[PDB]
Structure formats: C-alpha cells, structure tokens
Motif scaffolding. Structure first.
Motif, PDB file in Angstrom:
ATOM      1  N   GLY A 697       0.780  -1.230   0.000  1.00 29.58           N
ATOM      2  CA  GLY A 697       0.000   0.000   0.000  1.00 29.58           C
ATOM      3  C   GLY A 697       0.814   1.285   0.000  1.00 29.58           C
ATOM      4  N   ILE A 698       0.216   2.359  -0.509  1.00 24.61           N
ATOM      5  CA  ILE A 698       0.919   3.626  -0.684  1.00 24.61           C
ATOM      6  C   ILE A 698       0.685   4.594   0.475  1.00 24.61           C
ATOM      7  N   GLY A 699      -0.314   4.313   1.308  1.00 27.68           N
ATOM      8  CA  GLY A 699      -0.542   5.110   2.519  1.00 27.68           C
ATOM      9  C   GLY A 699      -1.371   6.366   2.299  1.00 27.68           C
ATOM     10  N   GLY A 700      -1.078   7.091   1.228  1.00 28.55           N
ATOM     11  CA  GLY A 700      -1.785   8.328   0.973  1.00 28.55           C
ATOM     12  C   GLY A 700      -1.336   8.980  -0.310  1.00 28.55           C
ATOM     13  N   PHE A 701      -2.139   9.947  -0.761  1.00 28.00           N
ATOM     14  CA  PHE A 701      -1.873  10.711  -1.964  1.00 28.00           C
ATOM     15  C   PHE A 701      -2.620  12.033  -1.978  1.00 28.00           C
ATOM     16  N   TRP A 702      -2.016  13.024  -2.634  1.00 25.57           N
ATOM     17  CA  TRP A 702      -2.652  14.304  -2.903  1.00 25.57           C
ATOM     18  C   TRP A 702      -2.766  14.398  -4.406  1.00 25.57           C
ATOM     19  N   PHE A 876     -16.812   7.730 -13.228  1.00 25.55           N
ATOM     20  CA  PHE A 876     -15.944   6.761 -12.574  1.00 25.55           C
ATOM     21  C   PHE A 876     -14.520   6.745 -13.111  1.00 25.55           C
ATOM     22  N   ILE A 877     -14.364   6.656 -14.426  1.00 24.98           N
ATOM     23  CA  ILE A 877     -13.026   6.572 -15.009  1.00 24.98           C
ATOM     24  C   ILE A 877     -12.217   7.887 -14.920  1.00 24.98           C
ATOM     25  N   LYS A 878     -12.823   9.006 -15.304  1.00 23.37           N
ATOM     26  CA  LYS A 878     -12.144  10.304 -15.190  1.00 23.37           C
ATOM     27  C   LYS A 878     -11.563  10.531 -13.788  1.00 23.37           C
ATOM     28  N   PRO A 879     -12.418  10.565 -12.757  1.00 25.75           N
ATOM     29  CA  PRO A 879     -11.916  10.783 -11.399  1.00 25.75           C
ATOM     30  C   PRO A 879     -10.877   9.744 -10.981  1.00 25.75           C
ATOM     31  N   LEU A 880     -11.024   8.505 -11.448  1.00 26.50           N
ATOM     32  CA  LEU A 880     -10.074   7.448 -11.077  1.00 26.50           C
ATOM     33  C   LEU A 880      -8.720   7.672 -11.745  1.00 26.50           C
ATOM     34  N   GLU A 881      -8.757   8.150 -12.987  1.00 25.86           N
ATOM     35  CA  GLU A 881      -7.555   8.534 -13.721  1.00 25.86           C
ATOM     36  C   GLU A 881      -6.828   9.612 -12.920  1.00 25.86           C
ATOM     37  N   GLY A 882      -7.607  10.529 -12.350  1.00 27.73           N
ATOM     38  CA  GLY A 882      -7.075  11.570 -11.491  1.00 27.73           C
ATOM     39  C   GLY A 882      -6.260  11.013 -10.346  1.00 27.73           C
ATOM     40  N   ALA A 886      -2.023  10.862 -10.315  1.00 30.75           N
ATOM     41  CA  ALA A 886      -1.381  11.568  -9.214  1.00 30.75           C
ATOM     42  C   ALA A 886      -0.443  10.669  -8.383  1.00 30.75           C
ATOM     43  N   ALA A 887      -0.893   9.459  -8.066  1.00 29.19           N
ATOM     44  CA  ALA A 887      -0.126   8.576  -7.189  1.00 29.19           C
ATOM     45  C   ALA A 887       0.779   7.631  -7.963  1.00 29.19           C
ATOM     46  N   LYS A 888       0.919   7.888  -9.260  1.00 31.15           N
ATOM     47  CA  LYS A 888       1.812   7.122 -10.124  1.00 31.15           C
ATOM     48  C   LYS A 888       1.504   5.624 -10.130  1.00 31.15           C
ATOM     49  N   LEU A 889       0.226   5.262 -10.182  1.00 29.04           N
ATOM     50  CA  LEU A 889      -0.150   3.874 -10.440  1.00 29.04           C
ATOM     51  C   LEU A 889      -1.019   3.888 -11.672  1.00 29.04           C
ATOM     52  N   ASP A 890      -1.267   2.713 -12.235  1.00 31.74           N
ATOM     53  CA  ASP A 890      -2.246   2.574 -13.297  1.00 31.74           C
ATOM     54  C   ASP A 890      -3.388   1.691 -12.811  1.00 31.74           C
ATOM     55  N   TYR A 891      -4.593   1.937 -13.312  1.00 29.58           N
ATOM     56  CA  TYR A 891      -5.750   1.142 -12.912  1.00 29.58           C
ATOM     57  C   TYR A 891      -5.939  -0.023 -13.877  1.00 29.58           C
ATOM     58  N   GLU A 892      -5.508   0.176 -15.117  1.00 32.21           N
ATOM     59  CA  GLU A 892      -5.376  -0.903 -16.080  1.00 32.21           C
ATOM     60  C   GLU A 892      -3.895  -1.130 -16.264  1.00 32.21           C
TER      61      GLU A 892
END
Ligand SMILES: O=c1ccn([C@H]2C[C@H](O)[C@@H](COP(=O)(O)NP(=O)(O)OP(=O)(O)O)O2)c(=O)[nH]1
Ligand SMILES: [Mn+2]
Ligand SMILES: [Mn+2]
Ligand SMILES: [Mn+2]
Ligand SMILES: [Mn+2]
Ligand SMILES: [Mn+2]
Ligand SMILES: [Mn+2]
Ligand SMILES: [Mn+2]
Length: 901
Positions: A697-702, A876-882, A886-892
DNA sequence: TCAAGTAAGCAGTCCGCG
DNA sequence: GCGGACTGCTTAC
C-alpha cells in the motif's frame, strides 16, 4: 422556580409574551412596552450611560415603540447616530429576564405533525388548498401522545375506520408495523366530514397550543396548507385561530412558476426539522425525503407500498393512516439521536432571542453582545449601511501531487476565535494602525516588529492589551462550552473502539450491558468487566456509546459553528459590528501563523534529521500542516517495528514529545513578535497515517489543493481498531456523485492505500464488467436546480444551459399533459442520467426529482436509453484517472514489453 | 435595519482551430 | 478533440 419565556412578538405598540411562571404554569400577557434609545451628549453631562467607545450618552424613554421608531428616523434625517437596541423584542427579553435563564424543557410544548391530502390532479398546492385534508397526526411532547385525525368520507372515497390491531402486526403478517413502543401512546379520532375534523383540530390546537412547532417540511407544505384550507372553508379569521394572538403574515413571495407561500404564525416558533437538519447536521444529502434521511440516520427500511400515493388512501386506507403516524414518529427518532431541538433551546435561551432566531448567527450574536454590554451600563452602536466588499481569507499551500507513504498531521484548536482572543480583536479594543510590510516578511521574521505596546496583526491593526473586549470575552465563554463537549465526544469515541475490540472475543454468557457514562474514558475495572461480556451486551454498549458520541458531536460542532460565525459575521454588512479591519486582522493573522509554523517545522525536522533544505511540510490549509514522516521512519528502519501499531506508537510519541514542544516554542516566538495579549495558538496532532506494515500500500496521496486521501490509524488520540480512510474533496465525498460510484471509488482508494496497484487493478476490472447491472438510481448523478426558467423556452435549452437544467427541460417536455407526473421544484435536487443518441426524448440527458423513482410513464424507455458508456467514463473513469495519475499507479495495465505464454 | 466568511476544484458551454 | 474564459455547483476550511 424562576420564570422563563416561551414566545415573544411585536404587534404595533404591543409586546405579546407567552411564558412559564414561577409556579410552572403557562401564561400569556400583553405589555405596552416602553423602550429606550440613546444619543451622544456633551462631556458636561451627569450620566451613567456611555457607548462602547467611552463617549457619553443620554437616555430617551419613549411612551410606546412607534415613537421610538419615529425618533430613530428623524435622527437619520438629521444625520446623528441613534444608539441602543432597536429590535424591541430583544430589549424586552433583556429587561424581563435579567439573569442566566435556567429553562425546563418538560414545560415547553413541542409539537410535531404531518398531514395527508389526496390529490388526483398533481401535487396539492398550499397556496390554493383546493383538496380535502384526509389525515393529520399531531404529537404533543407534554401529553406524550400521538393525536390522529382521520377522514372516513371525502369526495375521493369513503373508507372504514383504521385498525390499531392491524397497525401493530408485522408487515409480513399483513400489518403496518407501527412500532410497539408508541402503540399505547396513540389517540385515534375518526370523522364523517372534513369540517368537523378541522373544527375539532382547531379546538385541540387551542387547548394544546404549540410553543415550538416542527415536522418535515411543515414550513413549506403542512402549515401553509392547513392555514389555507381552513381559510377556504371557514374564512380567514377562523384560520387565524392557529396563532395564539390571532395574527398572521402572508407572505409571499410567490412567485412563478407558479406560486408558493409561507405563513408566519405570531406566538409560535416554527422550527422546520428539515432546516434544523440542513444547518446543524453537516451532511450534504443527495435528497431530503423523510424516507431517505430516516434510512440514512436510523438504518430503518423504506416505507413500502403499491400504487401511487394519490390512490393509497383508496386502495389501502389502513396503511395510509399508519404511514402518516410513522412519519411523525420518524422525526421524533431522528431528533432523539441528533438532538437539534435541545440545541436550539440551549442556544436560544443563552442568547435571549426568539428560538427560531438560532437560524441566524448575526441575530444570535447581536443579542449576546447586546446583553453583555447592557450589564456594564453600555450602549450599542447604531446599525449602519455598507457596500459589499470582497476581502482575503485563508492560505492554502500548493502540494506536489504524489503518493505520500507515512504522514502525520497537526491542526490548530479553534483557530479564528483563538486568534480573536490572542490578539484581543474587538470593535472597542482598536488602538491604532501600523505601517505594514509584505506578508512574507513577517512569516520569515525579517520585518520590523509592528509594536512594543499593542497587540498586532499583520494586516496593520493594533489592539489594547490591557482592557478586554466584549467579543473576546463572549466568544471565550462559548468556546469553553465547545471544549467540554468535544471531550465528551472524543471519550465516547475511544470508548467505542474499546468495545469494538472486545467484540472480537465474546464470550458466551447471558448478561446485561454495564451502567456507565460514555462521556468519560472507561476505567480499568470497567475495561475488565467488559472483556467478559457477551456479543449482545457489547453491541448494546456500542450503540449507546455511538449515540453519546453523536450527541457530543451535535453539541460541539455547532458551538464551533457559532463562534466561527462571529468571525465571519464581522465581514457581513448587516452585522452591527461589521468591520473589515477586524475581519482581515483575523484572516491575515491566520495566513501568517500557518506559514510561520510551516517554516519552523521544516527547520526543526531538518535539524533532528541532520539533513538540509528539505521539505517536510507537504501541504496545509488555513490552519493545518501535513508532515511527511518517511525520513523519521527511515532514520530507524525497517525492519524494525513488530507490526503497524508499533510505528504508529513511535510517531505518536515523537509528535507528543519532540514536535509538539518545538511547535509551541515556534508559536510562543510568534506571539512575542506580534506582542499579543495571550498565547493561544495550540496545534494538536491530528492523523497518523500510512500503509499496513508489510503490504504494498501507498498510505496516501494528494492530487492538488483540497483533494487528498489518507489511511489513518490514530486520530487525535483515538486509536482505531481497523484502519479508517480519511478522504477529503475527492468524488467519494461529493453528494453529486452516484451512490454506487461513491462506493466503488472508495474501494479503489482503500485498495491503493492498503494493498497496492495489483489489488486496485483486480477490483477495477470487476467493477467495469458489472457496471451495467446496477440499479439506475444508484448510478445516477445528482444536482441542485437553480435559476431554471432562465434557460427556457420553450421548453428547449437556451444559450449556456447547464447539463442538469437541460435534463429538467427534457423531463418537462416528456411529462407535458400528464397531470400525474411529479414536478421538478426550483432550488431542489435532481437525479441526472445521460441518454444515447437517437432516443425518443430528443436530447442528450434527462432529470427527475431525487429520492424518487422516476414516474412509470417514462421510466421504461429511460432505462432502455441510458448511456452506460458515457456514465462510467464520466463519473468513474475520469476521477479514477485523477487519483492514479497523481499517485503514479495505473488502474489498467499496461503493455509490458512482453508478453508470453 | 429580516442578512457568518473566503479559497478553490471539476463539469459543463461556447469559441477557436487550415 | 483540446485548451482558455466563463457559469454553476460543490467541497475544505
Ligand atoms: O465553516 C467554517 C469552518 C472553518 N472556518 C475557519 C475558522 C476556523 O477556525 C478555521 C480552521 O478550520 P477548522 O476546520 O480547523 N476549524 P477550527 O480550527 O475552528 O476548530 P478545530 O480545529 O478545533 O476543530 O477556518 C470558517 O470560517 N468557517
Ligand atoms: Mn362506519
Ligand atoms: Mn421486515
Ligand atoms: Mn406524510
Ligand atoms: Mn481537528
Ligand atoms: Mn483547526
Ligand atoms: Mn484539534
Ligand atoms: Mn483546520
């Protein structure tokens, strides 16, 4: 006992007061009240009266209130200040109750009611009241009884009497499930005709005349409807029997399309529960039906029935009457939890205002300050006119968008009022000004010290350190009340975690819940007795604790809202003590304090970490700092704690022992610098946050200002049994986000923060594959609808038309002609859904009122046309891309330069 | 004289663009 | 189809 008031009104030259006398009896009186106002006079005058500046004043005693008003106006026409309290009912209460009022709520008649009106031809308009009232239920808090008025014969159907035995039965046994604990409290009264029913209601009303009148939407529907129906059948003067002094105001406005109405009943304090909830509850709901809020607040179930409410009396009078009783009870249940009436009463009597004035911070404080000044024989200033001027508020640091693994946070206790007390800010403590440097120069301690003699703010203002201000004084008192209650709240919350933990190890016996005060931290013996209770016992205790905490929340957060209300009031032109110099003295000081303390915290942390010029403070808003703890964790490793709780304990100790004192040293220096009256910048530790030890886990993100998520283990001394997500600003927090998308983004976040990228992707695939199976109302967007007409006609979208307003028009064209469709209401919230190209609605989206299924007329061919592709992507996708960008991960993922079998 | 404040993000409209 | 100026709404404080 000592007397206290219930209601007060001004009627011409008359004050009408309802009150409780020294014996406990309810009484009424008419008083031809003689008010006083004041005028400056020369220093050569023998007078005990001075204004708040020390200027001498002479009293004018008027023979009636009309004259006082006349004089106030001549004084303006002459151009001289007319001092004193000009809201005469306030002065009256101040003269009549010259003591701290100890009220007794069991002598205050609190009424709660709901009406039903069958209406085959659309929503029953109160401004017309053209339909029979076929049911009223009216609960009286002094009788502790539900009075039920039931119409058996009306031109819309004859029905037989309602059955209390069937009301009681489980719904599964064909009953209505009127809860058993109110069955005995019901008093049922059938009626052959509407006239005798209303007559009897009015007679009842006279005997048991409400002091506080509440209900759900009573302000906009029930009251005006009853008033106007009685008017139409019996005439206005009978309708005026609803007011104990027989005077009412209508009111108006209207206006279009097409008409609404608000009655004012003199001698009753109306507190519509929906208003109390909007002000006091600090939630933002997608809807405000009683059923939605009941479910939200109470976890009870939707009030089910078949057919539209316009046919319910006809198809099932039995349920109709039962559902009417239950709605009234439901508002009783929401209030036993939230305690907003009790709060209204506390605040009203404390201020010495009319109870309905608690909705007005400006009015509340005008009376508090006035009363506090009148005790010292001082004279309040005249309320002046002012143009509206914008002015600067808080500072918010720009964060580098990133993931942040370990983070502690700190926040200033009651900042604005603390500032008001530290600097001693008040209309009458103004000492002078000083020449101002740019703000960066103060923050950096390079500017010349403002003063050697006065308390200062970096806005250029100076205040007397010696004499105390009416504001600081009165704002401290309320602050101290907030402190107390917050302690009760936090203690109940800690007590809650202790119970939760014990719920992992029941423990089979038969027992009773412990008899304890959840407002105080469980003693060790209590903690022992608990480790040995059953799941029943412990669940009863958790509930009780969570209710003590909610009560504590209500009492503390609204006392905070009040005090913060004073600071903001100083920037409101209608406030008697308006003054931008004071308003900005507060805000500018706040920006300095935050940025000063950022610098200091960076300086201390670099030191102890021996490192140089590195940013430890990663974010900050108004009065908070967010500190990266990676290098405090790393200084040690990793290993090197046994579990999560170990490092949490580490940072906790480090904040309490090292950082806390440096912060205090930092702010002590700042106080000296501005030469303040008293040091009150206290910055307590808030969140301790990070990923579970061992996990990915990453703990947090802005992602930017006001937009971050943290996995929190401890919050202001409350160590959580399970990690709790602190999400601020993200779509998961926005009432306009579909319910199901809220849940899905929350779970995506839980995963990122606790489990890492692989878990995130796993879940995201699942949600995409299943999106289209969700209930349409759970994936629908939500919006408030303002300034609708504007974007007609007719009725198609005009230029610049907002997307949700577009949807309403599309709805309005779809339901033209059907008198049955529920109408969108200006200022109300709506569901919104996008539509596929080529739909029979002729446009790209539709909207209907919220908390309601869409009308069966168009429902079937909305479902057929909903555009899922657009919904999913948009909400769902737009905000998730956000989040993930930001946290340098990918959802796909992600084309891996492989791949291979 | 019926009447807490400001800061700031995102979704959308309208316009620009070989 | 993307970025800039504006409205509308909604949170964070
Ligand atoms: O609705 C608000 C909330 C906050 N504020 C200002 C005043 C407050 O002191 C300041 C800091 O925000 P917090 O959310 O930290 N509230 P506060 O510091 O008063 O209380 P505490 O931190 O003790 O809960 O921002 C308002 O002006 N209006
Ligand atoms: Mn009969
Ligand atoms: Mn059931
Ligand atoms: Mn009802
Ligand atoms: Mn806090
Ligand atoms: Mn704070
Ligand atoms: Mn705090
Ligand atoms: Mn804060």
């Amino acid at each position: 006992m000592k007397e206290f008031y219930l209601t007060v009104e001004q009627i011409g030259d008359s004050i009408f007061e309802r009150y409780i006398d020294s014996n406990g009896r309810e009484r009424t009186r008419e008083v031809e009240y003689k008010p006083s106002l004041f005028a400056h006079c020369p220093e050569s005058q023998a007078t005990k009266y001075f204004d708040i500046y020390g200027k001498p004043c002479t009293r004018k005693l008027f023979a009636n209130m009309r004259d006082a008003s006349q004089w106030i106006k001549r004084m303006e026409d002459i151009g001289l200040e007319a001092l004193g309290m000009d809201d005469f009912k306030l002065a009256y209460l101040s003269d009549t109750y010259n003591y701290e009022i100890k009220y007794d709520h069991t002598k205050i008649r609190v009424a709660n009611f709901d009406i039903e009106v069958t209406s085959p031809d659309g929503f029953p308009e109160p401004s017309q009241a053209k339909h029979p009232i076929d049911a009223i239920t009216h609960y009286d808090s002094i009788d502790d009884r539900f009075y039920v008025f039931d119409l058996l014969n009306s031109p819309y159907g004859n029905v037989e009497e309602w059955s209390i035995e069937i009301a009681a039965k489980l719904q599964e046994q064909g009953g209505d499930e009127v809860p058993s604990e109110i069955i005995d409290k019901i008093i049922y009264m059938p009626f052959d005709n509407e006239k005798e029913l209303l007559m009897e209601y009015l007679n009842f009303w006279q005997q048991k005349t409400p002091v506080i009148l509440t209900g759900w939407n009573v302000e906009s529907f029930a009251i005006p409807y009853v008033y106007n129906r009685i008017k139409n059948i019996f005439g206005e003067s009978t309708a005026k029997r609803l007011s104990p002094h027989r005077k009412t105001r209508v009111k108006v406005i209207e206006n279009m399309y097409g008409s609404r109405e608000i009655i004012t009943l003199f001698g009753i304090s109306v507190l519509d529960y929906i208003d109390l909830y909007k002000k006091f509850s600090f939630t933002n709901q997608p809807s405000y039906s009683l059923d939605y809020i009941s479910e939200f607040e109470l976890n009870v179930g939707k009030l089910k029935y078949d057919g539209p409410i316009s046919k319910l009396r006809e198809s099932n009078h039995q349920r109709y009457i039962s559902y009417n009783i239950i709605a009234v009870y439901r508002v009783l249940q929401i209030d036993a939890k939230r305690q907003f009436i009790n709060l209204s009463l506390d605040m009203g009597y404390y201020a010495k205002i009319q109870i309905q004035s608690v909705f007005s911070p400006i009015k509340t404080w005008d009376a508090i300050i006035f009363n506090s000044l009148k005790e010292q024989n001082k004279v309040i200033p005249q309320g002046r006119s002012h143009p509206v001027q914008p002015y600067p508020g808080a500072f918010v640091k720009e964060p580098i968008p990133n993931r942040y693994k370990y983070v502690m946070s700190f926040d200033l206790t009651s900042l604005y009022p603390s500032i008001i007390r530290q600097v001693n800010i008040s209309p009458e403590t103004i000492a002078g000004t000083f020449k101002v440097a740019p703000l960066h120069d103060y923050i950096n301690a390079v500017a010349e010290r403002p003063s050697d003699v006065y308390s200062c703010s970096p806005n250029g203002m100076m205040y007397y350190k010696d004499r105390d201000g009416v504001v600081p004084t009165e704002i401290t008192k309320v602050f101290n009340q907030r402190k107390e209650h917050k302690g009760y709240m936090l203690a109940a919350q800690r007590n809650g975690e202790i119970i939760k933990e014990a719920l992992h190890n029941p423990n089979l016996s038969v027992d009773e819940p412990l008899d304890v005060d959840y407002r105080f931290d469980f003693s060790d013996e209590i903690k022992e007795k608990i480790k040995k209770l059953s799941a029943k016992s412990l669940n009863e205790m958790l509930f009780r604790a969570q209710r003590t905490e909610v009560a504590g929340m209500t009492a503390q957060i609204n006392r905070k809202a009040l005090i913060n209300g004073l600071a903001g009031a100083l920037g409101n032109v209608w406030f008697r003590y308006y003054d931008l110099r004071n308003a900005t003295a507060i805000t500018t000081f706040g920006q300095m304090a935050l940025q000063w303390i950022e610098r200091k915290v960076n300086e201390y942390l670099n030191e102890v970490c021996g490192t140089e010029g590195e940013a430890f403070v990663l974010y900050g808003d108004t009065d908070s700092i967010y500190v990266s703890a990676d290098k405090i964790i790393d200084k040690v490793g990793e290993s090197k704690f046994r579990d999560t709780n170990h490092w949490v304990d580490f940072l906790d100790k480090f904040a309490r022992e090292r950082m806390e004192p440096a912060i205090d040293r930092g702010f002590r220096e700042m106080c000296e610098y501005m030469n303040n009256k008293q040091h009150l910048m206290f910055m307590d530790r808030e969140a301790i946050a990070g990923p579970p030890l061992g996990s990915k886990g990453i703990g947090g993100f802005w992602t930017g200002k006001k937009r971050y998520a943290l996995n929190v283990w401890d919050m202001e001394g409350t160590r959580y049994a399970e990690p709790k997500l602190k999400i601020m600003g993200l779509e998961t927090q926005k009432s306009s986000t579909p319910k199901a998308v809220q849940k899905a983004l929350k779970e995506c976040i839980r995963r990122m923060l606790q489990e890492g990228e692989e878990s995130l992707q796993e879940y995201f695939k699942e949600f995409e594959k299943e999106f289209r199976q969700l209930n349409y109302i759970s994936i629908a967007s939500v919006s408030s609808a303002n300034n609708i007409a504007k974007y007609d006609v007719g009725g198609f979208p005009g230029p610049k038309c907002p997307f949700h307003i577009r949807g309403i028009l599309t709805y309005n064209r779809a339901i033209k002609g059907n008198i049955d469709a529920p109408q969108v209401v200006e200022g109300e919230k709506v569901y919104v859904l996008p539509l596929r190209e080529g739909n029979p609605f002729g446009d790209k989206c539709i909207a209907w009122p919220s908390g309601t299924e869409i009308t069966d007329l168009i429902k079937d061919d909305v479902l057929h046309w909903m555009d899922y592709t657009v919904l999913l992507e948009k909400t769902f996708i737009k905000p998730l891309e956000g989040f993930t960008s930001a946290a340098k991960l990918d959802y796909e993922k992600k084309a891996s330069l492989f791949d291979m079998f």
